[PDB]
Each structure stands twice: as structure tokens, then as C-alpha cells.
Scaffold this active site. Sequence first.
Site, short mmCIF file in Angstrom:
data_model
loop_
_atom_site.label_atom_id
_atom_site.label_comp_id
_atom_site.label_asym_id
_atom_site.label_seq_id
_atom_site.Cartn_x
_atom_site.Cartn_y
_atom_site.Cartn_z
N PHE A 77 0.84 -1.19 0.00
CA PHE A 77 0.00 0.00 0.00
C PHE A 77 0.88 1.24 0.00
CE2 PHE A 77 -4.44 -0.46 -0.11
CZ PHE A 77 -5.06 0.70 0.35
N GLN A 94 -7.44 15.53 2.63
CA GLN A 94 -6.78 14.55 1.76
C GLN A 94 -7.50 14.37 0.44
OE1 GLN A 94 -6.52 10.23 2.40
NE2 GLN A 94 -4.29 10.44 2.60
N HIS A 138 -7.63 11.88 -2.39
CA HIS A 138 -7.30 10.54 -2.84
C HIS A 138 -7.05 10.55 -4.35
CE1 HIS A 138 -7.47 6.06 -2.10
NE2 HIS A 138 -7.46 6.12 -3.42
N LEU A 154 -14.98 6.14 -5.10
CA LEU A 154 -13.61 5.74 -4.82
C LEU A 154 -13.22 4.43 -5.50
CD1 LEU A 154 -11.05 6.46 -2.77
CD2 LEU A 154 -11.85 4.33 -1.76
N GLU A 158 -6.73 2.21 -3.33
CA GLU A 158 -5.28 2.26 -3.50
C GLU A 158 -4.72 0.84 -3.64
OE1 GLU A 158 -3.10 5.66 -2.37
OE2 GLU A 158 -2.02 4.57 -0.80
N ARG A 170 -0.09 9.83 -0.54
CA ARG A 170 -1.31 10.29 -1.21
C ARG A 170 -1.34 11.79 -1.53
NH1 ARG A 170 -5.32 5.73 0.40
NH2 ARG A 170 -6.03 6.78 2.31
N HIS A 208 -11.32 13.18 -0.03
CA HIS A 208 -11.46 11.84 0.53
C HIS A 208 -11.52 11.83 2.05
CE1 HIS A 208 -11.12 7.47 0.53
NE2 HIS A 208 -10.17 7.58 1.45
N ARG A 268 -2.40 11.57 5.68
CA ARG A 268 -2.71 10.23 6.15
C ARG A 268 -2.15 9.15 5.22
NH1 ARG A 268 -7.72 7.82 4.61
NH2 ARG A 268 -7.41 5.59 5.00
C1 LIG Z 1 -14.78 7.76 1.94
C2 LIG Z 1 -13.93 6.54 2.04
C3 LIG Z 1 -13.05 6.44 3.11
C4 LIG Z 1 -12.22 5.32 3.23
C5 LIG Z 1 -12.29 4.31 2.28
C6 LIG Z 1 -13.17 4.42 1.21
C7 LIG Z 1 -14.00 5.53 1.08
C8 LIG Z 1 -14.95 5.62 -0.08
N1 LIG Z 1 -11.47 3.21 2.39
C9 LIG Z 1 -10.59 3.09 3.45
C10 LIG Z 1 -9.77 1.97 3.56
O1 LIG Z 1 -9.84 1.08 2.72
N2 LIG Z 1 -8.89 1.85 4.62
C11 LIG Z 1 -8.82 2.85 5.57
O2 LIG Z 1 -8.04 2.77 6.53
N3 LIG Z 1 -9.64 3.96 5.46
C12 LIG Z 1 -10.52 4.09 4.40
N4 LIG Z 1 -11.34 5.22 4.29
C13 LIG Z 1 -11.28 6.30 5.33
C14 LIG Z 1 -12.05 5.80 6.56
O3 LIG Z 1 -12.85 4.68 6.20
C15 LIG Z 1 -12.97 6.82 7.22
O4 LIG Z 1 -12.24 7.94 7.66
C16 LIG Z 1 -13.66 6.12 8.40
O5 LIG Z 1 -14.54 5.14 7.89
C17 LIG Z 1 -14.46 7.05 9.31
O6 LIG Z 1 -15.24 6.22 10.14
P1 LIG Z 1 -15.88 6.75 11.51
O7 LIG Z 1 -15.80 5.68 12.57
O8 LIG Z 1 -15.21 8.02 11.99
O9 LIG Z 1 -17.45 6.96 11.19
P2 LIG Z 1 -18.07 7.17 9.72
O10 LIG Z 1 -17.83 5.99 8.82
O11 LIG Z 1 -17.56 8.44 9.08
O12 LIG Z 1 -19.64 7.29 10.03
C18 LIG Z 1 -20.10 8.35 10.83
C19 LIG Z 1 -21.09 7.84 11.87
O13 LIG Z 1 -21.48 8.90 12.71
C20 LIG Z 1 -22.89 9.09 12.69
N5 LIG Z 1 -23.26 10.52 12.69
C21 LIG Z 1 -22.73 11.53 11.92
N6 LIG Z 1 -23.36 12.68 12.25
C22 LIG Z 1 -24.27 12.42 13.21
C23 LIG Z 1 -25.18 13.23 13.90
N7 LIG Z 1 -25.61 14.34 13.30
N8 LIG Z 1 -26.00 12.66 14.85
C24 LIG Z 1 -25.93 11.31 15.12
N9 LIG Z 1 -25.03 10.52 14.44
C25 LIG Z 1 -24.22 11.07 13.50
C26 LIG Z 1 -23.39 8.40 11.43
O14 LIG Z 1 -24.68 7.86 11.65
C27 LIG Z 1 -22.36 7.31 11.21
O15 LIG Z 1 -22.73 6.13 11.87
#
Ligand SMILES: *Cc1cc2c(cc1C)nc1c(=O)[nH]c(=O)nc-1n2C[C@H](O)[C@H](O)[C@H](O)COP(=O)(O)OP(=O)(O)OC[C@H]1O[C@@H](n2cnc3c(N)ncnc32)[C@H](O)[C@@H]1O
Lengths: 239, 613, 102, 138
Positions: free
Chosen positions: B122, B243, B245, B255, B258, B289, B356, B400
Site C-alpha cells: 500500500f 486529503q 485521494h 472511490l 489504492e 497520497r 477523501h 494520512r
Molecule cells: C470515503 C472513504 C473512506 C475510506 C475508504 C473508502 C472511502 C470511499 N477506504 C478506506 C480503507 O480502505 N482503509 C482505511 O483505513 N480507510 C478508508 N477510508 C477512510 C475511513 O474509512 C474513514 O475515515 C472512516 O470510515 C471514518 O469512520 P468513523 O468511525 O469516523 O465513522 P463514519 O464511517 O464516518 O460514520 C459516521 C457515523 O457517525 C454518525 N453521525 C454523523 N453525524 C451524526 C449526527 N448528526 N448525529 C448522530 N449521528 C451522526 C453516522 O450515523 C455514522 O454512523
Amino acid sequence: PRIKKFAIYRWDPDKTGDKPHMQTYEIDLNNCGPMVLDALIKIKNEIDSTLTFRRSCREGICGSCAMNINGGNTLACTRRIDTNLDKVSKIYPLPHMYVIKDLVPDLSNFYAQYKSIEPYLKKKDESQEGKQQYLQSIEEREKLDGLYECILCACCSTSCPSYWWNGDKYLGPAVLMQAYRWMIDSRDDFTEERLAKLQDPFSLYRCHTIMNCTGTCPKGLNPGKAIAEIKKMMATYKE
Amino acid sequence: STQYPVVDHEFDAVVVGAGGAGLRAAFGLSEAGFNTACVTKLFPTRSHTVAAQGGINAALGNMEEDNWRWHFYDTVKGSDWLGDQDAIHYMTEQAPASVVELENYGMPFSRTEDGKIYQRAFGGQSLKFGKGGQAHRCCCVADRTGHSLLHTLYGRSLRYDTSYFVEYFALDLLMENGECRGVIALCIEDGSIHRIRARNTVVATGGYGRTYFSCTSAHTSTGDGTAMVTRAGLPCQDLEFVQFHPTGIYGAGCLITEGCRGEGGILINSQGERFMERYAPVAKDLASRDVVSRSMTLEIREGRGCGPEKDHVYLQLHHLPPEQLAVRLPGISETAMIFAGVDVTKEPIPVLPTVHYNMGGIPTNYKGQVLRHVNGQDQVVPGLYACGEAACASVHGANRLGANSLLDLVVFGRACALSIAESCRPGDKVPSIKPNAGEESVMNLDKLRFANGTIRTSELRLSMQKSMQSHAAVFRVGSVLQEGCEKILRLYGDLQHLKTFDRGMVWNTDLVETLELQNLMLCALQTIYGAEARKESRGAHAREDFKERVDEYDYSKPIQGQQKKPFQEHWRKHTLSYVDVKTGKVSLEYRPVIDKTLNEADCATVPPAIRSY
Amino acid sequence: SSKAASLHWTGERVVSVLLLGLLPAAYLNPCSAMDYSLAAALTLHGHWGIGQVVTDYVRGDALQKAAKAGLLALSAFTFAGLCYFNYHDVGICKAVAMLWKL
Amino acid sequence: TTAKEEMERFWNKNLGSNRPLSPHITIYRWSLPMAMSICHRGTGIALSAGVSLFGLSALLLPGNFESHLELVKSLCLGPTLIYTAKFGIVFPLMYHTWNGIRHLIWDLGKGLTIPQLTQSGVVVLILTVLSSVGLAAM
Ligand SMILES: *Cc1cc2c(cc1C)nc1c(=O)[nH]c(=O)nc-1n2C[C@H](O)[C@H](O)[C@H](O)COP(=O)(O)OP(=O)(O)OC[C@H]1O[C@@H](n2cnc3c(N)ncnc32)[C@H](O)[C@@H]1O
Ligand code: HEM
Ligand SMILES: O=C(Nc1cccc(Oc2ccccc2)c1)c1ccccc1C(F)(F)F
Ligand code: SF4
Ligand code: F3S
Ligand code: FES
């Protein structure tokens, strides 16, 4: 300009004495994305911001936008709009479901069924977990392909006529395939008990091989085949 | 106020978020014996982490012999020395235990000849502290590892008695005299308002990718927890570090992992020449990245575009064996065909650098504790935690590393649960909130429900998204950024002019998206203002008027006899941003990066050096 | 942990292949011994078949128990009627034979 | 909150509300597999109704089978109408028989893909017509 009509199921719970009805929207496809969710978003953003629907990933892996498009259960973000202008796209919520509002169905029963099959790895001795990776061969892993990819969009279960008439007591395609997902996972030690949890007339045996589930699954999966494979295990497992 | 019902709940701990971080923290707290609530605007599976494709990094050493300290070095080097090394030590050491844990939870990792978890190459990772070539420590469930991570975590979560407030929109934090007391939230199903109070609150709301017009992130990445911290008067950190991507589809912006490049995929310009071999001689198209997408953006600018508009670049995969693609990358093969009509085993995929990941967020301890900044010194906010993309322990810093966020999630979700389990006990006094507390949030809600203005929510959102996309992209300069700032500030003035249509209580998406807009704006303002103030090129933030990397020293030459620059004279420091919610003005301060690790003897500090792959 | 639900299912497929084997067996070897087997197979397979239709549509614990009793009686009368036919009249195999050359 | 409790609360919520059921049979698009499932029920029910009526009349109605055949030759009509009577009996039998074999093959775990459904569906449909013409002509 290139106009396309959309007939969409509408119901407001806050509107006094309002009954379910269809509403039509006109959209220029030269100013819209190729997918049906794009249309729904566009009519939300420009035409009517009252159209309520679930959406998130936009790429077809979250399963939020699952709905009935033209008589078939799919995901709006993956189904491309029929460029045929003489035809009118008919959009409905998932069939035989309680409508919260517009195209948003109550899936809390669906999720509860998923909870009752215990969709997590179970070991007889769990005092060793978290310090050593469990061993699983390339072949044992391949058994999971076609099963683990499930999105829990609920398209299949909502397409099953058995799940319409008996959705209260019958687990349906989606949840059943997931029970099978843990059954042939080599790391799981509760194969026999998981099967016994289905030893009643409803949980598994309301499947009559209608096969609407496989034909509708937006991810190309085959729950009916897995249900068939469960039935074979129920008849053959000992003790 | 007599037209809104208020339902008060009582818990030991509240987790706001149902992604990787949100879940791991939620049931982690319940496992430790805490009566926990979990507040999420989506069903946990619908959360963005499901979209994750590449993998999760851990130095398990399954492909070749590996050391977690080598993962440490790669992360800090990638972070362009804005990464806090105390938090990077903690993450990389825990990495093996965290990934083994997931596999033991039931995560169906792809396997090897040995039966162990399959890891792959990666971008940005190396053996022997950079010297020993390409590293293979990216653990993955084929192409759908994020999907599997989220589904097993949710699967596991049902084993405990956590209370899940599904489809509940968190409005603001319940804050009293600097201390956090829980959250006020909207129940989407019936429009009711719920004050959920606890001794500790964990914010795991993820990123704010939707500030831009083009992003790989979901429609639900609206930085809601970021805005909740902002409205509390608390600081955000490094928000200008966005970031891009390298490999995002030219169509909808979806997306493409990578992992493509990690399995042997190549990037190709208009003339056919492998262009990434020129910018990075050693690492090539498997570089950092910030560097890879920098080159891609540069190639378009000198006429080497790959379309009828000449605005993108190709990602070649057809040279890789068909049986390799079907096993290692089944997910992208489908989405390339669906969104671009591309057979990956014959034709290349159109890719473009698109927004991203957000390495900025809520400033935090290595323990997950939210930090406020008083008298130039760090200070812990009592009963407030944050983990995941929403947080900024700055384990990623200025840039990142790929496959490090899924780790960032699992590690610091666990850490938040542990820091609570070790500082207090379940059943301890839940602090008593005021009878009129959260009144401003309900009033804000009510104002937006009946909002009859002149500018539609969607139109104002698009104005913000297009403004950020052209004023704060891959490359930025003082003038363009400054015009962006006073344009985003003018758009904040348009928030009193917004028009809403749906006036119902049940499932008012018109309303919640307008709430999401207020949140995105606060994230946008802080991103653009912090960006224009920073006059250096570090990681993803590249200034063309300030090409140089400004540290306390000139690290290109020896450290022996040199004069150390004052704090307010260099830029190797975290950006702390505040915004007055009324006027919408951005005031900003700065705090030092943490260089010292948790233990020097076990993991040595890595001082700044020349940054190139 | 009794396994009646899976046994019943297996029972169904067992009498299905039995009835499938019997139809040509009755054609090839039309005798009294086949007439009773055919009566046993037809009635049992039909009884379990309608049973599935009942469990699918008849909602309510009170009504479903009643429908299952009314089916039990109807099946009981059916098997008796066929056996009576086989004993006192010309028998299923010969009856089809007569009816078909009409 | 347990899975059992969530279901019990789901049904309490919706039945005591003004929430409407989403259309199902009126909107979902038809398919051959589904139509052939409905026919398998109909043919099953029709055949059971036949076997029962035949057995019940043996117990309840006077006379023997030979007598009842002579009663058919009363205001009887041509061999074409007799062919129709035989075809009307043998048609649902043959359909259910062949489609039942298909069901049994499914239970073994085979032929359960969408292309295979449409194939075996047509094969059953064709085999029904042929064996219904073939048997009615004996
Ligand atoms: C965009 C992306 C990111 C990504 C990826 C592919 C894509 C298309 N692939 C990755 C990978 O292969 N390996 C890796 O290490 N990272 C990868 N990324 C980045 C990473 O996945 C993200 O940064 C990460 O998933 C973030 O996860 P997190 O635990 O912080 O939570 P979330 O997935 O963003 O979801 C947010 C949750 O919070 C709740 N939420 C949001 N706002 C509210 C409010 N208003 N009130 C109540 N709940 C809220 C959502 O419901 C959700 O559950
Ligand atoms: C020898 C030829 C036959 C075969 C191979 C056969 C096979 C089957 C099978 C496998 C099923 C279950 C289908 C499912 O899984 O839903 C079934 C259903 C049924 N059968 Fe038959 N059968 C035959 C003849 C008959 C006859 C003569 C009768 C009349 C008594 C009959 C009555 C029924 C009924 C009432 C059902 C239930 C309908 C349903 O639940 O869909 N069958 N048959
Ligand atoms: O009645 C059955 N299908 C059925 C009944 C009514 C409608 C329907 O869909 C449609 C929907 C739209 C058009 C046509 C049929 C399917 C059925 C058939 C065989 C076995 C089990 C069943 C049952 F489980 F009970 F559902
Ligand atoms: S099997 Fe297919 S239709 Fe069913 S829940 Fe999974 S992805 Fe959706
Ligand atoms: S649609 Fe159906 S009844 Fe069985 S084969 Fe699939 S669950
Ligand atoms: S919205 Fe994610 S599946 Fe369509």
C-alpha cells in the site's frame, strides 16, 4: 432538452387525513446523473424538497436507498434510468411494509430478525480470543464468497411472497442467508445449535422456493440457493 | 417549548456515531460494564466505513518478517511531522492486537497459503525504517474490508445491552461550565427531542467531505460532531488539511481503492508514459497520497488530460491477471463497470484526485480525550471524548497513510472506552443538567423548520461546495484563498436567508439536511480560513507562493550549530480554529506537535527530514 | 432439542419420490397391492400439501388449529373412501383404465 | 433490548398507527418462476380436491363405479368433447408432476440460478403440453 416522467408514491403522516397517492415529476436528463437516486436527489433539490427517502453511499454498498423501481426491488444509486422517454418510471417503497413517510419503510422488524440469529463468531472456549489470529485455509475462506457480501438492503426479503404473508414469524431470505454465512464459517463452533434455532414451522420452513429473492438482489447474490443449502443441513446434521 | 416534547434519558456514557470508531467505543464501554447509549443518524451498517475498500494496517508479519516500529516510522514520515508521535506510537503498537481482535470477532479476512490474514502493499509503507523496500502489512477482506469491518463490529455489538438510538440526529452537546453532560438530539421518526445525559460523551461522527463539490465520501459525511464542538466554543484542529485521494472515478466521484496500485496497478497520462515514475523514482505510483494526487493535478494543467475535456488520468489494471483481479479487487471491478462502463481486465479506469479524508477534526489525547487550549497550554475537557475521522489526535498529521484510518478507528474507539473505564466506575453520579438546557438547539431547530426565506438549502449548499472546490483544491495561493474566504463568509450571511418547505415532524429530511448545512458551513469556514493563514507547503496543504516546508530548523542541513526559530515564526504546529456562531468570523490559534513517544527506549523519536518518496 | 420440523420436511420429499415412482409402477403393474399404496401415497402427500397452504394463509392460533382439524377429518374420510373403493369396487388402477377407454 | 422485545414493540407501534402498507401484488412485476409457483399451488389444490371428491363419493353416494360410467353416456357428445374432459383432468396432473420433479431437483441444491430457472421453467412448460396431448390420446 430531454424530459423524463417519474411517478412516485407519496404519503405524509403529519398531514391530517391524507391517503397514499402518486405524484409525477418532470426531469431533463441532460442535467441529471445516470442513476435513479440522482433523479430523486434532483427533484428533492430543485422541484420538491418534501420527497423523503433514505440515501448515503451513492455507490451501492450501504443499502440505504433500497426501493421498488418499475416493479422490481433494487438500489436507486445502481439502477440506471431507462432513457426511453415514452415510458414513465414508477417508484414505490419496498412492498408489504409499513410506510413511515413517502418511500421510507419501517425496517426495525427486519433488523430484529437479523439480531435473533446471532450474526457473530462463536467459540466454545473464548478465554484465548484477542491474542492469536484464528487459522482459516484458502478453501475454507472461499465458502464465504457469495454470502458475506450482503448489504442488508432488504430487497430480497421484501420481494418474497412468504415474507409478505408471514413476515412476523418467518425470517426471510436476507436473515437466513446470514445464518448460513455463520454455519459454514470454519471458525464457528455453534453449527449444530444455529440449525436447531430453526426447528419450527416458520423460521426457515416458510420458504417454498419461489426464488424472487435471487432474481431481485442488487448485489448479484443467491439467498435462495443458501436457503436450499440450509434445508439440506437440517436434514443431515447429527446429534 | 410546549409544541416540542422533551424526553430526558440517563446513561453512564453516550457515543455519538455508529461507524467503526462509534461501534468499537460503544460496545467497548458496555463490555467494561458501562450502561452505554449510542446515538446515530443512520443505521450502523449504512455508516461510511462500509464503503472502505483498501484495508487495515497491522504489522502482523504474514507476508514477510515485520516490526510495528517500521509502521510507526512510515506513519510519522507520511504525516510530514505534524503527526503527534505519542499517538502514533500507541496506534502502531496496538495495531496487531486490534486486527487480531477483529479476526477473532469474526471478520472474514482474505487468507494465505499458511491460513493467516492476507496483507498487501500500500502507498507510503516500507521495511527497515525506509531502507528495506516495499512493505506488505495491509490486512484486507478482498476489496470490501471496510464493509466487513463494520458488519462484524455491528454483529458483535448485539452481544451487549447497549441502547441504540437509531436514526437520531445529534444537534448539540449538553455543556455546563466547560464540562460535557451529554447530547441533545432529534428523533427523526416522530420529530421529538431527546436530552441524553451521561458522565462521559464520545464523539465519533466521522468527516466532513461534503464541504466540497467532488468527494469519495457519502452524502452523510457532514461533520456534525465537528460543528457541535464548534458551537460549544471549543477548538477544532488542522481542518485545512484535506486529503485528496489520487484514484477516484471521473463520473460520480466514487472511490477506487489504492489496493489497485498496491496489487500492481499503474497511472497513465495522455502520451502513455508512466508519469508517476518521474515524480517518485523509488516508490513510484505507490508513494504518499499528497504526492501522487499532486502530480495528477499537475499533469492536467500542462495539457496531459485523458478525455474529451482533457481533465483526468487513466488507472491501468488490464495487465494484471484476470484471476488476480477477481480475488483481490472484486468490488472496484463492479463499480468501474457500473459508473464508467469499464471492463477492468481490458480497459483502464478514468481516475481523478477528489476529496477523501479529513485528517483535521476535534483535538485529542492519545487516550481519546478532547483538548481545549487555555493560556497556550493543553487542557482536558471533562467528560468529552472523540475518536475516528471526527477526531484529531493527529495520528495522521499533515497527510494520512492509506489503510491507516480503519486502524485509527478500531484503536482509538477502544482507547476511549479504556480511558473511561479507568477514570470512573459504572453507576457513578451522572451530573445534573439545567431544566432549560439545550434550548438554543431546539430554537435553532424550530427556526429552520419554518424557515421561509429567499435561498433554497440545496442552492446554498451547492454555492458552498463549488466555492470550496475552486478556491481550496490540491494547489492554492494567498489571493485565490482570500477571495474564497470572503465568499464563504458571505455565504454564512446567507444562512439567515434560507428557504425550507417541509413543515412536518415525521422524517423531515428537508430540515435535517439544512441542519447538515449549518454544520458543513462551520466546517468550511474553518478549513478555508486556516488554509489561507498557513503560509507553507506541508503534506496535503500546498502553497505555490510558499513552496518551502517551514520548521523550527532547516532540517535539510545538519542540526549541530543552528538557531531555533520562535513558535510564532515557524509552521510545524497544529492549527486551532474557533468561529463565533453569530457573526461567522474565524479566530485561530496554534499549539505544538508532540514529538516525544510513550517510551524512547522501546520506540525512538523520529526527527524531521527531507520529505520525498 | 427435538427435530420435528426437519423430519417432517424430509418425510414430505420421501413421499414425493414415492408417489412419483408409483404412477408409472401402477401403469406397468396394475394390481390390488398397488391400489392401496396409491391410496396411502395420494392421501398423505395431499394432506401434508394442504397443511402447508393452511399454515401459510390461516392466521390466528384459534383458526389454524380448527383448519388443521377440519383437514385431518377430510383426509381421514378420503383415505377410507379410497380403501373402501379398492376393497368393494373395481380399484383405482382398473377405474382409471375403464374411464380412459370411453 | 432483546430481538424478541424489538419485534413485540414493532408490531405494537404499527398496528396502533395510521401507517399504510406499501403495495405488493398490485405493483411488483410478474415473472415466470413466480407464476409457475402459483400454478403449482393451484394444480396441487385442484388435484387434492379431486382425490377427496372421488373418495368421499365412494362412501357417501349410492351405486358402483360401473354404474356411474353408464350415467356419463346419457346426454353425451362427440369424442372431441371426451378428449377435452381427459385433457382437463390430465393437464394439471402433468404440470404439477413435472414442476414437482423440478422442485425435488431444487431441494437437492441444483439448478437454482436465474438462467437455470427460466430454462427448466420452459422445459417443464413444454413437457406438460406434450405429456398432456400424449396421455389424452391413449
Ligand atoms: C470515503 C472513504 C473512506 C475510506 C475508504 C473508502 C472511502 C470511499 N477506504 C478506506 C480503507 O480502505 N482503509 C482505511 O483505513 N480507510 C478508508 N477510508 C477512510 C475511513 O474509512 C474513514 O475515515 C472512516 O470510515 C471514518 O469512520 P468513523 O468511525 O469516523 O465513522 P463514519 O464511517 O464516518 O460514520 C459516521 C457515523 O457517525 C454518525 N453521525 C454523523 N453525524 C451524526 C449526527 N448528526 N448525529 C448522530 N449521528 C451522526 C453516522 O450515523 C455514522 O454512523
Ligand atoms: C407424482 C407426481 C407428484 C409429484 C412429483 C409431486 C411433488 C410435489 C412437491 C415436491 C411439492 C412441494 C412443492 C413445494 O416445495 O412447495 C408438492 C406440493 C403439493 N402437492 Fe404434489 N406431487 C405429485 C402429485 C400430486 C397429487 C396427485 C396431488 C393430489 C393429492 C398433489 C397435491 C399437492 C398439494 C396440495 C401440494 C401443496 C401445494 C403447495 O404448498 O405449493 N400432488 N407436490
Ligand atoms: O401464494 C403464493 N404466492 C403468491 C400469492 C399471491 C401473489 C403473489 O405474487 C404476485 C405478485 C404480483 C403479481 C402476481 C403474483 C405470490 C405461494 C405460492 C406457492 C407457494 C407458496 C406461496 C406463499 F408462500 F403462500 F406465498
Ligand atoms: S442478499 Fe441481496 S437483496 Fe438480500 S439483503 Fe443481501 S444484498 Fe440485499
Ligand atoms: S423469494 Fe422466497 S419463499 Fe424462499 S426462495 Fe426466496 S425466500
Ligand atoms: S445509497 Fe448507499 S446503497 Fe444506494
